[PDB]
C-alpha cells in the first residue's frame with residue numbers, strides 16, 4: 305500500500321457511519337499503522353472494537369476542549385510511537401440551538417466561542433502538542449464544509465468556524481512546512497452520519513445535493529477515505545495548505561435545474 | 562452628498578490615524594449624519610473633539626467585549642435615533658503575544674478566543690442589539706485584511722479571526738437581506754494606523770507593498786473612506802455579502818521585480 309510504514313493518529317470515530325471510520329478503513333487498507341482516540345467513556349468500548357478490526361491496540365482518551373487532556377494523550381502515544389507521521393482531525397461541535405432558524409437570532413457569544421474553540425482551535429492545539437514528535441514528511445488533515453465559503457441555512461455559526469478552520473490550515477501549513485510537515489483539509493459534501501442529524505431538515509438537504517450534483521450522487525465515507533489516504537501519503541508531497549473539494553463537483557456548478 | 566438623509570454609527574475612532582476616521586470624514590462630507598462610540602474613558606476626550614468637528618454631539622461608551630455594554634449603547638442611542646441606517650465596524654484585537662513569531666508556537670487557546678470574539682463575533686452581536694432599529698435600505702460595513710485569504714507572517718491568529726469575519730459578513734447578508742439590510746466588508750491594504758505599529762515588522766511590510774502593488778503606492782484612509790461611504794449609500798443597493806479589495810490591486814499580483 306502507498307501508506308505502508310506510516311503511523312497515523314485517527315480521531316473522531318464514533319460509529320461505522322463516521323467519516324473518520326471511512327478514513328481509518330481506507331488507510332489501513334493501504335498499509336498504515338493506526339492509533340485511535342475516543343472523546344469519553346461512552347465511546348471507548350466502540351472505539352476499541354473498531355481499533356481491533358484494524359489491527360490496532362492503541363486507544364487513547366482525548367477531549368480537545370481540555371489542553372491537559374491533549375497533553376496527556378500525546379504523552380501516552382509517546383510510549384509506543386516516539387514519532388509518528390501526522391494525524392487526522394475529524395472533530396466539530398456547537399450546541400444544537402446554534403444550528404436552527406435565523407443565523408443572527410440563533411448565534412450567541414457562548415455558542416460562537418464553543419464552535420470556534422472545538423471546531424477550529426483544536427486542530428492547531430494538537431499540532432502544537434505533538435510538534436516535535438512528527439517525522440519529516442508527516443501530514444496533518446482536517447475536514448471542512450462548503451458552509452465556510454458560502455452562507456448555508458441552519459449551518460450558521462459552524463460556517464464561520466469552518467472558515468476559520470481553513471485559514472488555520474493555511475497558517476499551519478505555512479509555519480510547519482520548513483520542518484517537513486504538510487497540512488491540508490478535505491471539504492466534503494453532505495454525508496449522512498450521526499451528528500449530521502443536527503442541522504435542521506438535513507434529510508431533504510442531501511436529496512438536493514444529488515440531482516444538482518455533477519456526478520449525480522453524493523459522496524460516501526469511502527470517497528472521502530480514499531482522498532484522505534492520498535493526502536496523508538508521500539504521493540501528495542507537493543500539496544500543502546490546500547482545501548480539496550470532495551463533493552462530486554457540487555460547488556463548481558450553478559443553477560443545475 | 563449621496564449619503565444625505567442617513568444616520569450612521571461609526572466605531573473604532575481612536576485617533577485621526579484611525580481608518581474609522583477616514584470613513585466618518587468621507588460620510589460626513591457626503592451629508593450623512595454620524596454618531597460615535599468609544600472603547601474606554603481614556604479615549605472619550607478625543608472622540609468628543611472629532612465628533613464636534615463632524616457636526617455630531619452623540620458620543621457613547623461601547624465595549625464590544627460586553628453584551629450589556631452593547632445593549633446600553635443602543636439604548637442610549639435609541640433616545641436620539643429611534644431608527645438609523647447602519648453602522649461601520651472598525652474593531653479588532655488580539656494580545657500582542659499572538660502577533661509575533663511562528664504561528665503554531667504563539668497561538669494559545671486564550672489568544673484564539675479573544676481574537677475571534679472581539680474581531681469577528683462583535684460584528685454580529687452589534688447587529689443583534691440593533692436589528693429592530695434598522696430602516697429598510699440600511700447597510701452594515703466591516704473591515705477585513707488579506708490575511709484571511711492567505712497565510713501572512715506574524716498576522717497569525719488574527720488571520721483566522723478575519724476569515725471568521727468574512728464568512729460572518731456572508732451569513733449576515735443572507736439572513737438580514739430580506740429585511741432590507743445589506744452587509745459588506747472592505748479588505749484594506751496596509752495603512753500606518755494607531756494599531757498598525759502593533760504588528761511585528763509593519764513599516765517594513767508597508768514599504769514592500771507600495772512597490773509590488775499595481776497602482777505603485779499603498780492606500781490611504783481617504784481611499785478606504787470613499788469606498789466605505791459608497792458601500793453604505795443606496796448607490797450600491799446591488800452589492801451585499803461582498804468583500805471588496807481596497808488595496809491598490811496587491812492581492813491580484815505576484816512575483817514583481
Ligand SMILES: NC(=O)c1ccc[n+]([C@@H]2O[C@H](COP(=O)([O-])OP(=O)(O)OC[C@H]3O[C@@H](n4cnc5c(N)ncnc54)[C@H](O)[C@@H]3O)[C@@H](O)[C@H]2O)c1
Pocket residue numbers: 315316317318319321322323324342343366367368369393394395396397422447448449491492493494495496497498499500
Ligand atoms: N457529515 C458530513 O456530511 C460532513 C460534511 C463536511 C464535513 N464534516 C466534518 O467531518 C467531521 C466529522 O464529522 P462526522 O460527519 O464524521 O460526524 P461524527 O458524529 O461521526 O464524528 C464527530 C466526532 O466529533 C467528535 N467530537 C466532538 N466534540 C469533541 C471533543 N470536544 N473532543 C474530541 N472529539 C469530539 C465526536 O466525538 C465524534 O467522534 C467534522 O469535522 C465534520 O464537520 C462532515
Ligand SMILES: NC(=O)c1ccc[n+]([C@@H]2O[C@H](COP(=O)([O-])OP(=O)(O)OC[C@H]3O[C@@H](n4cnc5c(N)ncnc54)[C@H](O)[C@@H]3O)[C@@H](O)[C@H]2O)c1
Pocket residue numbers: 572573574575576578579580581599600623624625626650651652653654679704705706748749750751752753754755756757
Ligand atoms: N491598519 C491596517 O493596515 C488595516 C488593514 C486592514 C484592516 N484593518 C482593520 O481596520 C480596523 C481598524 O483598525 P485600525 O487600523 O483603524 O486601528 P485603530 O487603532 O485606529 O482602531 C482600532 C480600534 O479598535 C477599537 N477597539 C479595540 N477593542 C475594542 C473593544 N473591545 N471595543 C470597542 N472598540 C475596540 C479600538 O478602540 C480602536 O478604535 C480593524 O478591523 C483592522 O483590522 C486595518
Ligand SMILES: Oc1cc(Cl)ccc1Oc1ccc(Cl)cc1Cl
Pocket residue numbers: 395396397398399400448449462493494495499500502503
Ligand atoms: O460539518 C458538517 C457539515 C454537514 Cl453538511 C453535515 C454534518 C457536519 O458535521 C457537524 C455539524 C454540526 C455539529 Cl454540532 C457537529 C458536526 Cl460533526
Ligand SMILES: Oc1cc(Cl)ccc1Oc1ccc(Cl)cc1Cl
Pocket residue numbers: 652653654655656657660705706719750751752756757759760
Ligand atoms: O488587521 C490589521 C492588518 C494590518 Cl496589515 C495592520 C493592522 C491591522 O489591525 C490590527 C492588528 C492587530 C491588532 Cl491586536 C489590532 C488591529 Cl486594529
